[PDB]
Design a protein around this ligand. Structure first.
Ligand SMILES: [Mg+2]
Ligand SMILES: [Zn+2]
Lengths: 49, 147, 97, 49, 91, 1095, 98
RNA sequence: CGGAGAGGUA
DNA sequence: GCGGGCTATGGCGGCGAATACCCTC
DNA sequence: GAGGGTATTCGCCGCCTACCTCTCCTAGCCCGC
């Protein structure tokens, strides 16, 4: 819900996520950027870090 | 029925209750995230949030006094309507009816607006950032440089 | 001059339409008030010299400079990721000469 | 968008007359404006992609 | 559309601009010509039932494939009858 | 012949003009002045209207008062009326208001009379209506000391407007009409598909128009009588789902004010109220004339009505249906026939010009309506025989709306004062984006265009190059606005093939009817064209040939479609529209150079562009100079009177550029009325001089002038050829505040003695001290009632230069200070900026660039005689960009600099037969002019290059081709091939590198989100945009992106620890959590969502 | 979980907040629509900026001034009722309106 | 240094 | 009478869902 | 009428990045000293 909220229609995404009580597995690139953790790409892959 | 089931199953499956749509309390954002700037000359600018919070608090106190002192159900219902409109403006101003406008007929930035648009938090403060150790000048061609 | 020696600096131009809009060069002090940009990276940055400006960014952590020196160095980025064609190719005055 | 049937008959070396210059500006301004609007649209397309 | 709007309506798969009908089954076609419409009917060479594309505007031009589309011309399972753009969903 | 005869002290600037000048360029600022003196109703406007509009000369304020008054109660027992608006002398002269901060305004008074309709008692008074901002002699309103310009607005003229959109189902015409009123209510009447005609009153549901007629009381018989030919309206009649009249009336009321008893009486009242009134709906005379012209209802009766009528609506519907089906005209009874046709809302006849007078009038109108509501309210809540005019009138709304307009409007724009031309072009701008106009984000591509009606009314060139492309035009040179608001352009009535004088100012609509002829057409001085076929804009801007009998009118000059800054480009017809636009937008950015030099190859629109811009001090009346000094000329008139002109020396413009004015006359000279008596910021002997004449080569040179860059000689730096003076304005004030006692004291708490050396006894730096960045300017303490912070104004980041002037306004000196202050000390720091690498020189043709290198004068391509070229421009920029006009300018600049002599020893040359005399021989440094579209041909340039004078010895350095044989100063060997050389006029743009260089390691940080601050002013840091994160992600660089987004921006502990790590030797610490993410979490919770970070 | 922060995150979760959760978040109630007093230029009491609800406006400084030293840390003021701690707490604590 | 508006550069 | 604080219609396309008009039982 | 199948209409969402400069950020009125 974090990536979709930051993309577009933040109100609709946030309210539907709140209704559905969605949990965001911080596994994406945009989300890891938002929380300020290493992006799972490039020199962030578990192999390389 | 399918469109309705999409919303009903959401509450059915989880332990959350649909009673969260109706509020008995309203949270107040921390002040440092809605500060007032005391420019020289007493020119204290209050964020749009503080104005709406004041509207809601005023109407809540009004309705509280009217119930405590007793009043005809018509007046109390009218005050509850005004409180409902004030809270609706606070959460999402301009969605229903005429936006609550401040000085110079401009709609106020509600809580819903801090999270929307290119100016909202998501696309302004989270994705893009401002960074130290950075500068900017005009570029000119240096032909004696190396790649 | 000793401090900035061999410390990559990421030069950025807006809009950063593609990956090569950010590239890391080696800073050299120049007398003046304008960043001097090597003419071959102009096509990559899509930058001419009619008043265009560019941002400068300095990585700090040893990890960050490793990216700036290996991943992002300009000399290592010669081919366009879109098609693989060379972007540090001579053009304009070089082609005429 | 239709072509002017005149047409422009003088090069930019001989120097265009008043009418030729005007009917050339006709098409030049559309190019500039469409360039601006299309970069605006391409930014949005790139963001979505 | 033939530019950036075309790219947008492609990647968004909206409904192009002119949803030129496409063939659904192989066999010959019994197109009839009218105004503001045609009668592009495809015989089911497979052996089922005929396909119907009638009220689709006649202003829309036909397409040439392999031979220009015409009555009696054989159209394959996905050959496009009109020309222009096809809706990505139906294909 | 030459430059001109109108200006007395015109420099002898010979012109290549072939065609004559039937008319002289009007006053360029006359639009603003003549639209404001109409507003205040000055005697000069009355005289102007006398020889034209003598039928009804009424001013803007007078019109507003007449429309408003009388103000009467419901019973009609009393009335209030206004009349004879009156102005007094301005409180202070223009310089005083600009200096202090007072607005340049004058009192406004009106005679108010109160009449009681049951006692006959009449009480009259002179009620003060506030201070009215006044217009200076140039066209600028001084507001709060700052000088502002009210930009004319291209609104849509109110009235009926048809169209012929095409449906997707029916695929027919769907003719839609909208009777666009001024401050009214839209009453569209569409032809909805399925052969149905309907209304869309206001923006509510679409009831049929037969319903509207039934509400009007119209009988179905009457409708189908006047609508008999219409099958669609007949269908809408019998198929209407409504009968009678009360049904339709109630139906309208159902949507007008839902939730109220829709009684027939109220429906009738509102039907009359919305449209047929004149206090809630006013088409305005501009709209009424448009409607009458379109429908041809009342051709003879004067316009003395601004409300709709039944005839108007029925004629609208009849025109709509006749447009439907397929008509060619209509013959509505009681009026002349008119063609049936749609409306193009781009056509300049369908969009008018809200000049400054109209805008100020509208804002006064809304203020007066606000006052009218108050006076009507107070007319019923105060006892009779105690009411007086002065006790019912509350000025507040009016004085508030005036300030609202002059402070917080899109049209009251901070004036552009980069150079004398920027202001003059600002005062003649047509901005289509204001309140009641288009929006920049929403404006499409049909408005951002050149219309064939723009010819001679709006310049097709000189448009903003960014998002305002087409929404901000410029008024052409000869154009003027008619009383309604539409623009008119001069022509030259050609009669029976004779191109006769008696210019007639046609408008766009009448321009369409006739056939206009191009002035460049070959008139043989005998009133008859040479060839019969001359191109003409036929009807809808279709250029075509025609016989001389068909031709009706003619342009005034080949130079009529272009604006004032685009007319200063030489060889404009040789540049492409894009590059000419860039050059026109660049002439408005050239900075005033310390010395000025008029172009050798200008056009001619530079003396008038300076005498009509208001920076050259044109002498008021003829006389003899008596004493001339740097700060004052004293003309001793021919009647014994002396009028001393004071020169504004080293002032600050709106953009920090110096505003030098220096006298150009001697103590014995005799000047004439209208003669230029002193130069201005960018002027040389009264002509615009925005740059310098530099020797240019057109060769590529070692790659330093690569991709639009420029190579300058060091001579331009040593000799101050391009050295601009800039001035900055630093201010600080000591507010009273609730605590009190704020004082500008010298003694700075917790300060050193050395830093305090400069400040004078009062605590203000001594004028003439070079205050470098960081130095103290005004020691100010803050007595937070010792609690005194040394918040002293200091030389801001990136400032320097001497202190040239201090202005301090003291409360003890009974000054007009803001409320709650005591002192408003202000300082000026001036700095001379030489040209350096990064500055953005640019010619007049769009050949902009940034100086890539300043070579020493030794290693420069020098001619055979040793003269080093001053500038080198790359060859690859010219042919691609289609701005060859710069090359022709270079050639003619060489010819002008060298001087020439055509040898007519045995007959004049063939190529010089039509060359004007006085141009067959020119001494060196002879300034010439090539009018914008009638200048130097190519053969004449060839010839004038063939014959030029030797320099000192009998050696011609530039051959017939125009290319010299240069010597490479860097190596010595001559360049293998000849190189194009000449003198090109280039201008130093206001895009210096000194204002753009900027860097940050650490500094101020934002408050709500702890990201750094933005902008070069408060240090600030460059933004790592969203699409600069995509590039880093694509590179795979994770750690650099992480550090950039965490420990450089909003990880406060991370930031401080990173700084400590770098200053010490320790490794760079690990990141934390973005403060922005926590802010987002708190905001999401505040919405009412229990966001949580599980583990 | 995870309270404020510290990068061991996974599965950031969102959902509707009940009045009980809202009352658990808030460190007080706001029942007076005031922002600040002009004369003293200090936060009002029980307003939208109350130091007893959101936290000190200065580092280790109570409203009344009975405590202004670091050694006094974590003690809730006996007189003014504001908790003594660092001023950054005003960014995190929330209030609620009943 | 927060908002609104205007102008401008690439 | 003056100062301070408190209150109060020139965008445009896509899309979906909240709703006019007509045949059937 | 209920009901369904079609249309019809209106509300909402979206509309490149980065940067420089400037000007305004209330008004009315009711109570208190
Ligand atoms: Mg450029
Ligand atoms: Zn305390």
């Amino acid at each position: 819900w974090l990536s979709a909220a930051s993309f577009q229609e933040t109100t609709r995404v946030l309210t539907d996520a709140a209704i559905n009580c969605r949990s965001d597995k911080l596994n994406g690139l945009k989300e890891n950027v938002i929380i300020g953790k290493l992006i799972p790409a490039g020199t962030g892959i578990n192999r390389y870090r | 029925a399918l469109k309705r089931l999409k919303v009903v199953a959401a509450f059915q499956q989880s332990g959350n209750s649909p009673m969260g749509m109706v509020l008995d309390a309203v949270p107040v954002i921390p002040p440092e995230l809605r500060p007032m700037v005391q420019l020289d000359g007493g020119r204290f600018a209050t964020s749009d949030l503080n104005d709406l919070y004041r509207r809601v608090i005023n109407r809540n106190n009004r309705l509280k006094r009217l119930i405590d002192l007793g009043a005809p159900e018509i007046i109390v219902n009218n005050e509850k309507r005004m409180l409902q409109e004030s809270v609706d403006a606070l959460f999402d101003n301009g969605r229903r009816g005429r936006p609550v406008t401040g000085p110079g007929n401009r709609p106020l930035k509600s809580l819903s607006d801090l999270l929307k648009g290119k100016q909202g938090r998501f696309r302004q403060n989270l994705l893009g950032k401002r960074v130290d150790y950075s500068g900017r000048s005009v570029i000119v061609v240096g032909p004696q440089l190396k790649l | 001059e000793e401090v900035i020696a061999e410390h990559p600096v990421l030069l950025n131009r807006a809009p950063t339409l593609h990956r090569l809009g950010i590239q890391a060069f080696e800073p050299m002090l120049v007398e003046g008030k304008a960043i001097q940009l090597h003419p071959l990276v102009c096509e990559a940055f899509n930058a001419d010299f009619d008043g265009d400006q560019m941002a400068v960014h300095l990585p700090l952590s040893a990890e960050a400079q490793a990216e700036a020196r290996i991943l992002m160095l300009s000399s290592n980025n010669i081919l366009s990721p879109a098609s693989g064609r060379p972007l540090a190719m001579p053009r304009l005055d070089m082609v005429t000469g | 968008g239709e072509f002017i049937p005149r047409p422009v008959k003088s090069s930019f070396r001989e120097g265009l007359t008043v009418l030729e210059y005007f009917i050339n500006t006709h098409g030049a301004r559309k190019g500039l404006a469409d360039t601006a609007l299309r970069t605006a649209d391409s930014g949005y397309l790139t963001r979505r992609l | 559309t033939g530019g950036l709007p075309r790219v947008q309506e492609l990647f968004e798969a909206r409904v192009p601009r002119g949803k030129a009908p496409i063939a659904d089954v192989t066999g010959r076609v019994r197109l009839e010509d009218g105004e503001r419409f045609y009668k592009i009917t495809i015989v089911p060479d497979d052996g089922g039932e005929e396909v119907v594309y009638d009220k689709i505007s006649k202003r829309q031009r036909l397409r040439v494939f392999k031979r220009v589309l015409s009555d009696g011309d054989h159209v394959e399972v996905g050959q496009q009858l009109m020309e222009g753009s096809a809706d990505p969903h139906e294909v | 012949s030459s430059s001109n005869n109108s200006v007395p002290g015109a420099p002898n600037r010979v012109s290549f003009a072939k065609l004559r000048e039937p008319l002289e360029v009007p006053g360029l600022l006359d639009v603003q002045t003549d639209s404001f003196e109409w507003l205040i109703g000055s005697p000069r406007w009355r005289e102007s209207a006398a020889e034209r509009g003598d039928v009804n000369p009424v001013g803007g304020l007078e019109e507003v008062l007449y429309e408003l008054s009388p103000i009467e109660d419901f019973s009609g027992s009393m009335s209030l009326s206004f009349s004879d608006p009156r102005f007094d002398d301005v409180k202070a002269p223009v310089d005083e208001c600009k200096d202090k901060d007072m607005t340049y305004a004058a009192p406004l008074f009106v005679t108010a009379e109160f009449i009681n309709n049951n006692t006959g008692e009449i009480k009259s008074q002179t009620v003060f209506m506030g201070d009215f901002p006044m217009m200076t002699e140039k066209g600028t309103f001084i507001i709060n000391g700052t000088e502002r310009v009210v930009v004319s607005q291209l609104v849509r003229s109110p009235g009926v407007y048809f169209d012929e959109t095409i449906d997707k189902s029916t695929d027919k015409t769907l003719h839609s009409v909208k009777v666009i009123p001024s401050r009214g209510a839209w009453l569209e009447f569409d032809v909805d598909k399925r052969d149905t005609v309907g209304v869309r009153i206001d923006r509510k549901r679409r009831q049929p128009v037969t319903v509207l007629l039934k509400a009007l009381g119209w009988t179905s018989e009457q409708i189908v009588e006047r609508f008999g030919f219409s099958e669609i309206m007949r269908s809408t009649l019998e198929k209407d789902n409504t009968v009678g009249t009360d049904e339709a009336l109630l139906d309208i009321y159902r949507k007008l004010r839902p939730g109220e008893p829709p009684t027939k009486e109220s429906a009738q009242t509102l039907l009359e109220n919305l449209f047929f009134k004149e206090k809630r709906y006013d088409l305005a005379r501009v709209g009424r004339y448009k409607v009458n012209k379109k429908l041809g209802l009342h051709v003879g009766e004067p316009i003395t009505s601004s409300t709709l009528t039944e005839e108007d609506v029925v004629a609208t519907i009849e025109y709509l249906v006749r447009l439907h089906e397929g008509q060619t005209t209509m013959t509505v009874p009681g009026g002349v026939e008119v063609p049936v046709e749609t409306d193009d809302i781009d056509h300049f006849g369908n969009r008018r010009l809200r000049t400054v007078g109209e805008l100020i009038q509208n804002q006064i109108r809304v203020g007066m309506s606000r006052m009218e509501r108050v006076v009507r309210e107070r007319m019923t809540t105060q006892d009779v025989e105690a009411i007086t005019p002065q006790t019912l009138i509350n000025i507040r709304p009016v004085v508030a709306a005036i300030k609202e307009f002059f402070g917080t409007s899109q049209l009251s724009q901070f004036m552009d004062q980069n150079n004398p031309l920027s202001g003059l072009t600002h005062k003649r701008r047509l901005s289509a984006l204001g309140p009641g106009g288009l929006s920049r984000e929403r404006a499409g591509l049909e408005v951002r265009d050149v219309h064939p009606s723009h010819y001679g009314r709006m310049c097709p060139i000189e448009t903003p190059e960014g998002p305002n492309i087409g929404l901000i035009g410029s008024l052409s040179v000869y154009a003027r606005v008619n009383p309604f608001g539409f623009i008119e352009t001069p022509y030259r009535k050609v009669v029976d093939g004779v191109v006769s004088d008696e210019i007639v100012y046609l408008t766009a609509d009448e321009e369409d009817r006739h056939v206009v002829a191009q002035a460049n057409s070959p008139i043989d001085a005998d009133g008859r064209f040479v060839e019969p076929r001359v191109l003409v804009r036929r009807k809808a801007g279709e250029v075509e040939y025609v016989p001389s009998s068909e031709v009706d009118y003619m342009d005034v000059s080949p130079r009529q479609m272009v604006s004032v800054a685009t007319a200063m480009i030489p060889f404009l017809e040789h540049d492409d529209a894009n590059r000419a636009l860039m050059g026109a937008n660049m002439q408005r950015q050239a900075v005033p150079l310390v010395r000025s030099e008029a172009p050798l190859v200008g056009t001619g629109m530079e003396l008038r562009a300076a005498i009509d811009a208001g920076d050259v001090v044109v002498a008021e009346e003829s006389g003899v100079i008596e004493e001339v000094s740097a700060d004052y000329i004293t003309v001793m008139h021919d009647n014994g009177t002396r009028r001393t002109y004071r020169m504004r020396k080293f002032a600050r413009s709106n953009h920090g550029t110096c505003a030098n004015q220096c006298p150009i006359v001697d103590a014995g000279d005799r000047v004439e009325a209208g003669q230029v008596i002193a130069d201005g910021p960018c002027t040389d002997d009264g002509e615009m001089a925005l740059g310098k004449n530099l020797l240019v080569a057109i060769m590529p040179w070692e790659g330093h002038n690569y991709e639009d860059a420029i190579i300058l000689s060091n001579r331009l730096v040593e000799e101050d050829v391009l050295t601009s003076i800039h001035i900055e304005e630093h201010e600080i004030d000591a507010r009273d505040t609730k605590l009190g006692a704020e004082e500008i004291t010298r003694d700075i708490p917790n300060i050193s003695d050395e830093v305090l050396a400069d400040l004078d006894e009062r605590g203000i730096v001594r004028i003439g001290a070079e205050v470098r960045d960081g130095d103290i300017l005004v020691g100010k303490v803050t007595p937070k009632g010792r609690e005194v912070r040394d918040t002293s104004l200091k030389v801001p980041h990136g400032e320097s230069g001497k202190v040239i002037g201090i202005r301090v306004f003291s409360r003890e000196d009974e000054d007009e200070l803001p409320a709650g202050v005591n002192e408003l000390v202000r300082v000026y720091v001036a700095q001379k900026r030489k040209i350096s690498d990064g500055d953005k020189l640019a010619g007049r043709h769009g050949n902009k660039g940034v100086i890539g290198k300043i070579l020493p004068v030794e290693d420069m391509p020098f001619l055979a005689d040793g003269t080093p070229v001053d500038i080198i421009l790359n060859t690859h920029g010219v042919p691609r960009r289609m701005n060859i006009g710069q090359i022709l300018e270079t050639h003619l600049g060489w010819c002008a600099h060298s001087g020439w002599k055509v040898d007519a020893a045995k007959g004049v040359p063939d190529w010089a037969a039509r060359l004007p005399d006085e141009l067959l021989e020119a001494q060196p440094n002879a300034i010439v002019s090539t009018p914008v579209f009638d200048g130097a041909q190519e053969a004449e340039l060839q010839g004038l290059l063939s014959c030029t004078l030797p320099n000192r010895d009998g050696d011609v350095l530039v051959d017939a081709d125009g290319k010299a044989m240069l010597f490479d100063g860097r190596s010595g060997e001559p360049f293998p091939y000849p190189v194009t050389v000449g003198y090109m006029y280039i201008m130093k743009l206001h895009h210096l590198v000194d204002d753009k260089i900027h860097a940050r390691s650490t500094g101020p940080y934002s408050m709500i989100t702890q990201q750094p601050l933005g902008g070069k002013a408060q240090f600030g840091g460059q933004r790592f945009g969203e699409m600069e994160c995509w590039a880093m992600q694509a590179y795979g660089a994770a750690y650099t992106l992480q550090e950039l987004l965490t420990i450089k921006s909003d990880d406060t502990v991370g930031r401080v620890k990173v700084y400590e790590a770098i200053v010490k030797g320790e490794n760079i610490p690990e990141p934390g959590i973005p403060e922005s993410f926590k802010v987002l979490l708190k905001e999401l919770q505040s919405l009412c969502l229990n966001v949580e970070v599980l583990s | 979980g995870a309270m404020l922060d510290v990068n061991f995150f996974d599965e950031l979760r969102i959902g509707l907040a009940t009045a009980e959760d809202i009352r658990q978040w808030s460190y007080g109630e706001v029942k007076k629509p005031e922002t600040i007093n002009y004369r003293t230029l200090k936060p009002e009491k029980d307003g939208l900026f109350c130091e007893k609800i959101f936290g000190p406006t200065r580092d280790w400084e109570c409203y009344c001034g009975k405590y202004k030293r670091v050694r006094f840390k974590g003690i809730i003021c006996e007189r003014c009722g504001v908790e003594v701690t660092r001023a950054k707490v005003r960014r995190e604590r929330m209030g609620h309106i009943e």
